[PDB]
Curated annotation (Swiss-Prot), chain B:
Organism the protein comes from: Homo sapiens
Family (UniProt): Belongs to the G-protein coupled receptor 3 family.
Name of this protein: Metabotropic glutamate receptor 2
Record localization: Cell membrane; Synapse; Cell projection, Dendrite
Organs and tissues of expression: Detected in brain cortex (at protein level). Widely expressed in different regions of the adult brain as well as in fetal brain.
Function summary: Dimeric G protein-coupled receptor which is activated by the excitatory neurotransmitter L-glutamate. Plays critical roles in modulating synaptic transmission and neuronal excitability. Upon activation by glutamate, inhibits presynaptic calcium channels, reducing further glutamate release and dampening excitatory signaling. Mechanistically, ligand binding causes a conformation change that triggers signaling via guanine nucleotide-binding proteins (G proteins) and modulates the activity of down-stream effectors, such as adenylate cyclase.
Lineage, top ranks: Eukaryota, Metazoa, Chordata, Craniata, Vertebrata
Curated annotation (Swiss-Prot), chain D:
Annotated localization: Cell membrane
Oligomeric form and interacting partners: Interacts with PICK1.
Protein name (database record): Metabotropic glutamate receptor 4
Side of membrane Cytoplasmic, spans: 20-33, 85-108, 182-194
Whole-protein residues included: 592 to 850 of 912
Swiss-Prot record, chain E:
Region (G5 motif): 143-148
Modification ADP-ribosylcysteine occurs at: 170
Disease note: Neurodevelopmental disorder with hypotonia, impaired speech, and behavioral abnormalities: An autosomal dominant disorder characterized by global developmental delay, impaired intellectual development, delayed or absent speech, hypotonia, behavioral abnormalities, and epilepsy that ranges from self-limiting to intractable. More variable features include non-specific dysmorphic facial features, distal skeletal anomalies, and brain imaging abnormalities.
Maturation and modification: (Microbial infection) Deamidated at Gln-23 by Photorhabdus asymbiotica toxin PAU_02230, blocking GTP hydrolysis of heterotrimeric GNAQ or GNA11 and G-alphai (GNAI1, GNAI2 or GNAI3) proteins, thereby activating RhoA.
Annotated protein name in UniProt: Guanine nucleotide-binding protein G(i) subunit alpha-1
Organism: Homo sapiens
Subcellular location as annotated: Nucleus; Cytoplasm; Cell membrane; Cytoplasm, Cytoskeleton, Microtubule organizing center, Centrosome
Modified residues (Deamidated glutamine): 23
Length: 62, 124, 46, 259, 173
């Protein structure tokens, strides 16, 4: 439950940054960094939290 | 690197029965130490490149200067994994607890990357 | 297609010559002097 | 051992440069006092690893407490009062005029050893009340039903002793971070305001990640080379992240002397 | 009578200024033939805010430059290029700053003929002509009568717009 609870909270936190960034794209501070590579980095965090459940994920060959 | 190693190895169920005849382990594929060390070696090599490239980004007009946050990310993550070696090599008796270490350190590493870089930008 | 093959080989060689001259032309800054004459243009070109 | 050999060489290399080039080019930015005692504390921390895991017996167990106790309590005693000084002039100079009387090399030394003097009298309390005794072996554990059984050579120091002793250094850790965090705005001594604040955050990461090490290995692993060699690594890294951030840039600048 | 491209190199950067002007034709027919330029340099004579064209007898020497400067910046061709301003012969302007009232050029201006003050008002009057200034930047400079150290400014001015131009396409800005 511990790893799952923190992962669930982190997944919502990642969407908070993604949702704000696209909404506030007109603000020059967010576009100062690489916009194309920012979503990849933001996506990697989301995949990182989603992959946390994979370590148990009903272990089997597949 | 992973695909080549996967082809050499075999993905399947290698569950074994403990000699104690009590609390049999779950369906285990293979060792998590040597069969997966290839990913660690590749990641470490590019971490130094990222740190080295961050040594020249300091002389940037504030907004483009994120070397302070990059350095903390490249240090906090290394400290987490450097201190993770005793944890994995000590709690190696009960599998349900050793696997819990997999799901906590990874989550901490992801939070550090988001917290150190995205949060200061999100603050403004 | 014998002379045609050699013609393509010559075209490839001069293609590199045009390509390498592109960076040299692009490596130099271009500035345009504007304004009425006898207003100090001599003192900024000599 | 890897950190000890490079650490003991690094601390001797910097001190030679830091004293041979005593023309006050950039060295005068920091006081001559509170910069050698802190460096000497790092010297003790690096020398602690050499003496800690070295022929564990009655003599070495007693030496383990004093060197480890004085190694880190001295290093962070100067760090706290150095950070305290930076806040005092910045706060006093913002509105009032000048600084209180204790900002002076002669008077600042007295309070620096005042924190050390607490350990000097304190370390005698555990030494006298509970003298270190070389336990032959903790044979109740590390013995197996088959013919193979070795045991562990445990020392007199226990969980209560090390936690309380390290607690004083930990008590000195929070107060440095609190003082350094408050003075985020540009204080006096520009050249030695950012490295002090950044080191404390860097050092706290090491100790905050040491909490699961202590409460993560008292279950299965041997209590012979996990509670004695892992602890000295954190001590070495704690000094390393302080020596590296503070003195190493000064050596690099003074090597290519710009002034 | 044609244009002159001069070469001069400083601090490991090669420059190729184009002396376009001798041309007495439409100019507009080849104004667009001078695009892709990183920046332009505009030379202004400070001691000409009083002088009046003898042939015209109605247009001031400095006021004539105002129409030319406005047309250059306001056109759609030069919207993506920066403007570099040069002021020539400040010694005569400083001598005439009190000798000739700033009003002669700026009647609205009523400030002391003190050079520092007058120089400030005329400088601000250059940049308030373009309708859009978000993507337009002007690098005003004073140079000298001999203009010995003007090379350093133009080297710095182009560096500011070279980096700015690169970031515009990459999307970092
Ligand atoms: C001996 C064992 C390890 C000891 C490590 C000692 C060296 C690092 C100490 C502290 C680490 C992070 C400090 C960042 C803040 C800072 O110091 O910033 C300092 C600079 C300047 O940036 P500025 O904003 O001040 O501009 C000021 C303009 N004049 O920023 C940076 O980008 C530094 C370059 C990145 C380096 C990051 C850490 C280097 C090693 C990473 C690997 C860690 C392995 C550890 C495992 C043993
Ligand atoms: C600032 C944030 C990132 C801190 C996150 C701390 C997390 C990783 C820590 C804090 C408290 C921890 C829990 C404390 C106690 C237990 C009960 C034990 O039987 C299983 C592990 C479990 C469930 C821990 C899991 C990890 C845990 C949830
Ligand atoms: C030179 C060092 C201090 C640099 C920092 C090392 C850090 C990043 C840590 C984190 C994970 C670590 C690795 C984890 C696992 C193994 C397998 C074992 O056989 C020890 C070496 C090796 C391969 C470790 C080497 C050190 C390591 C890469
Ligand atoms: C890199 C940094 C920021 C990581 C910080 C992680 C902190 C918040 C986590 C990591 C390890 C955790 C500890 C692991 C185990 C225990 C023992 C349990 O009985 C009580 C909670 C306690 C004491 C946890 C408290 C929270 C803790 C200290
Ligand atoms: C240092 C960084 C990675 C943060 C720490 C995360 C991991 C390593 C922490 C978080 C929770 C911790 C566990 C919390 C509680 C227990 C039960 C105790 O009887 C033995 C240690 C054990 C099993 C801890 C081992 C280390 C642990 C799994
Ligand atoms: C600097 C950033 C590092 C990122 N990192 C860190 C560790 C990492 N492993 C997880 C633990 C494995 C391991 C197995 C046995 C003993 C110690 C360790 C080795 C592989 C990966 Cl796969 C990675 O990608
Ligand atoms: C909290 C923390 C951060 C970094 N480091 C340590 N200490 C360590 N010590 C060893 C070790 C040395 N020898 N054997 C094991 C590790 C693998 S991590 N702690």
């Amino acid at each position: 439950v511990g790893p799952v609870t923190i992962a669930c909270l982190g997944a919502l936190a990642t969407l908070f940054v993604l949702g704000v960034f696209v909404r506030h794209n007109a603000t020059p501070v967010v576009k100062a960094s690489g916009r194309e590579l920012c979503y990849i980095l933001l996506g990697g965090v989301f995949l990182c939290y989603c992959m946390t459940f994979i370590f148990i994920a009903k272990p089997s060959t597949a | 690197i992973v695909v080549a190693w996967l082809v050499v190895e075999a993905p399947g169920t290698g569950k074994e029965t403990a000699p104690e005849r009590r609390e049999v382990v779950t369906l285990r594929c293979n060792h998590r130490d040597a069969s997966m060390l290839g990913s660690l070696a590749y990641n470490v090599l590019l971490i130094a490149l990222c740190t080295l490239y961050a040594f020249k980004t300091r002389k940037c007009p504030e907004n483009f200067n994120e070397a302070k946050f990059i350095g903390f990310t490249m240090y906090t993550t290394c400290i987490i994994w450097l201190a993770f070696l005793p944890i994995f090599y000590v709690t190696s008796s009960d599998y349900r607890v050793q696997t819990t270490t997999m799901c906590v350190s990874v989550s901490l590493s992801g939070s550090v990357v988001l917290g150190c870089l995205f949060a200061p930008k999100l603050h403004i | 297609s014998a002379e045609d093959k050699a013609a393509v080989e010559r075209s490839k060689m001069i293609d590199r010559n045009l390509r390498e001259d592109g960076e040299k032309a692009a490596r130099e800054v271009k500035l345009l002097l504007l304004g009425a004459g006898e207003s100090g243009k001599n003192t900024i070109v000599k | 051992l890897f950190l000890a050999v490079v650490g003991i060489a690094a601390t001797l290399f910097v001190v030679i440069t830091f004293v041979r080039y005593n023309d006050t080019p950039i060295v005068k930015a920091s006081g001559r006092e509170l910069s050698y005692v802190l460096l000497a504390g790092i010297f003790l921390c690096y020398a602690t690893t050499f003496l800690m895991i070295a022929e564990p017996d009655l003599g070495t167990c007693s030496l383990r407490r004093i060197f480890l106790g004085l190694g880190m309590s001295i290093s962070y005693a100067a760090l706290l009062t150095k950070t305290n000084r930076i806040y005092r002039i910045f706060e006093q100079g913002k509105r009032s005029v000048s600084a209180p009387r204790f900002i002076s090399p002669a008077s600042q030394l007295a309070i620096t050893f005042s924190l050390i003097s607490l350990q000097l009298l304190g370390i005698c309390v555990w030494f006298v009340v509970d003298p270190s005794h070389s336990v032959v072996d903790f044979q109740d554990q590390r013995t197996l039903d088959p013919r193979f059984a070795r045991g562990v050579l445990k020392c007199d120091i226990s969980d209560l002793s090390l936690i309380c002793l390290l607690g004083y250094s930990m008590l000195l850790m929070v107060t440095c971070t609190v003082y350094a965090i408050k003075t985020r705005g540009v204080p006096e001594t520009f050249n030695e305001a950012k490295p002090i604040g950044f080191t404390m955050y860097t050092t706290c990461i090491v100790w905050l990640a040491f909490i699961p090490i202590f409460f993560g290995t008292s279950q299965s692993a041997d209590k012979l080379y996990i509670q004695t060699t892992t602890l000295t690594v954190s001590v070495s890294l704690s000094a390393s992240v302080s020596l590296g951030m503070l003195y190493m840039p000064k050596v690099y600048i003074i090597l290519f002397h710009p002034e | 009578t044609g244009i002159v491209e001069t070469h001069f190199t400083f601090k490991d950067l090669h420059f190729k200024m184009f002396d376009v002007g001798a041309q007495r034709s439409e100019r507009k027919k080849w104004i667009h033939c001078f695009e892709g330029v990183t920046a332009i340099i505009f030379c202004v004579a400070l001691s000409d805010y009083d002088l009046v064209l003898a042939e015209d007898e109605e247009m001031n020497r400095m006021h004539a430059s105002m129409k030319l400067f406005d047309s250059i910046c306001n056109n759609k061709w030069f919207t993506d290029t920066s403007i570099i301003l040069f002021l020539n012969k400040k010694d005569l302007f400083e001598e005439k700053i009190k000798k000739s009232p700033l009003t002669i050029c700026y009647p609205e201006y009523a400030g002391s003929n003190t050079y520092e003050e007058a120089a400030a008002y005329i400088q601000c009057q250059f940049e308030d002509l373009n309708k859009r200034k978000d993507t337009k930047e002007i690098y005003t400079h004073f140079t000298c009568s001999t203009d010995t150290k003007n090379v350093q400014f133009v080297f710095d001015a182009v560096t500011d717009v070279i980096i700015k131009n690169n970031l515009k396409d990459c999307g970092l800005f």
